[PDB]
Design a binder for this molecule. Sequence first.
Ligand SMILES: OC[C@H]1O[C@H](O[C@@H]2[C@H](O)[C@@H](O)O[C@H](CO)[C@H]2O)[C@@H](O)[C@@H](O)[C@@H]1O
Ligand SMILES: OC[C@H]1O[C@H](O[C@@H]2[C@H](O)[C@@H](O)O[C@H](CO)[C@H]2O)[C@@H](O)[C@@H](O)[C@@H]1O
Ligand code: MAN
Ligand code: MAN
Ligand code: MAN
Ligand code: MAN
Ligand code: ZN
Ligand code: ZN
Ligand code: ZN
Lengths: 140, 138
Amino acid sequence: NGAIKVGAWGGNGGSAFDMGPAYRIISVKIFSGDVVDAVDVTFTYYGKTETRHFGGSGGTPHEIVLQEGEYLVGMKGEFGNYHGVVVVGKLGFSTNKKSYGPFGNTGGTPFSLPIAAGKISGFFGRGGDFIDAIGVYLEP
Amino acid sequence: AIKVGAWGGNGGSAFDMGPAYRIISVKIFSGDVVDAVDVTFTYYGKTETRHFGGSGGTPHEIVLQEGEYLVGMKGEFGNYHGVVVVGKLGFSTNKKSYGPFGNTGGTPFSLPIAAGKISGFFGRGGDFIDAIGVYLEP
Ligand SMILES: OC[C@H]1O[C@H](O[C@@H]2[C@H](O)[C@@H](O)O[C@H](CO)[C@H]2O)[C@@H](O)[C@@H](O)[C@@H]1O
Ligand SMILES: OC[C@H]1O[C@H](O[C@@H]2[C@H](O)[C@@H](O)O[C@H](CO)[C@H]2O)[C@@H](O)[C@@H](O)[C@@H]1O
Ligand SMILES: OC[C@H]1O[C@H](O)[C@@H](O)[C@@H](O)[C@@H]1O
Ligand SMILES: OC[C@H]1O[C@H](O)[C@@H](O)[C@@H](O)[C@@H]1O
Ligand SMILES: OC[C@H]1O[C@H](O)[C@@H](O)[C@@H](O)[C@@H]1O
Ligand SMILES: OC[C@H]1O[C@H](O)[C@@H](O)[C@@H](O)[C@@H]1O
Ligand SMILES: [Zn+2]
Ligand SMILES: [Zn+2]
Ligand SMILES: [Zn+2]
């Protein structure tokens, strides 16, 4: 509904997910090991603060807590075959303050989304055992 | 405004066409490398053309038909005899995909647009197209 969605980068495995845009991403938690297992996002939508759980439940958590006036302004990673499956094998974000990651240890086809104007407001993609694919909502 | 990119190097001079009402056509000049781009578009009742990059290469026109929009951009950038330039460049509309054009591989980048469209360009250019980036509209 006026949305701008770029991606998803990755494979066609797993099931579709789409959190829609948020008023405020509070934190992003990337679960990884060899590969990107999953992503938890906690956010406020119309007053309510929710957490959605994407991908699978393996891997080690890596939390990005957004400070007041800190926004996600970049996403990059790599997707490739992980013993049969095209999943996001490395995943990273940058904010207007600091860069995070990349998380994951499997190299593959790089992708990169530098945002010169605007910010990330939400996520979509595909998840199964791991993060098959990830994509992003943009707003000014 | 939503500006994404630019992908490529830091050589050349910065260009910025701003967002347009409607992309009419994109002409991609390439050889070994992406030399340049001509973008024809409408702007507040005026129709305009901008050249970004140099004069080398063979052109490939993407002419946009009725209710056809740019919903994807992809290519590769790399060091080409001393300068980091777009070595391959491609686009997709809602109806079909184009190219990619250029014959020099490098670091890939891809911008699929699930919702929204490309409404304009910015980046860097010299005698080749050093870098390209994109304005996004809903
Ligand atoms: O990120 C994927 C996964 O990586 C690591 O586990 C490996 C695999 O689960 C599988 O191939 O079994 C291996 C046998 O020893 C194991 O290394 C862990 O980091 C895990 O938490 C993660 O889910
Ligand atoms: O667009 C690429 C590049 O063009 C110009 O660079 C010059 C050429 O690469 C060539 O003639 O060799 C010169 C010296 O090695 C070089 O300056 C410039 O516009 C440059 O900024 C740009 O990157
Ligand atoms: O450097 C952070 C690092 O931590 C662990 O070793 C794993 O979770 C990796 O996926 C991650 O890359
Ligand atoms: O997450 C990767 C992988 O996980 C499971 O094995 C299935 O859901 C696959 O469809 C999916 O591609
Ligand atoms: O792309 C760089 C270069 O490639 C080829 O040599 C030709 O097609 C030229 O026109 C072009 O300038
Ligand atoms: O390889 C893509 C593209 O690269 C060059 O610029 C030309 O030779 C084109 O005719 C060709 O289609
Ligand atoms: Zn979770
Ligand atoms: Zn294997
Ligand atoms: Zn021209």
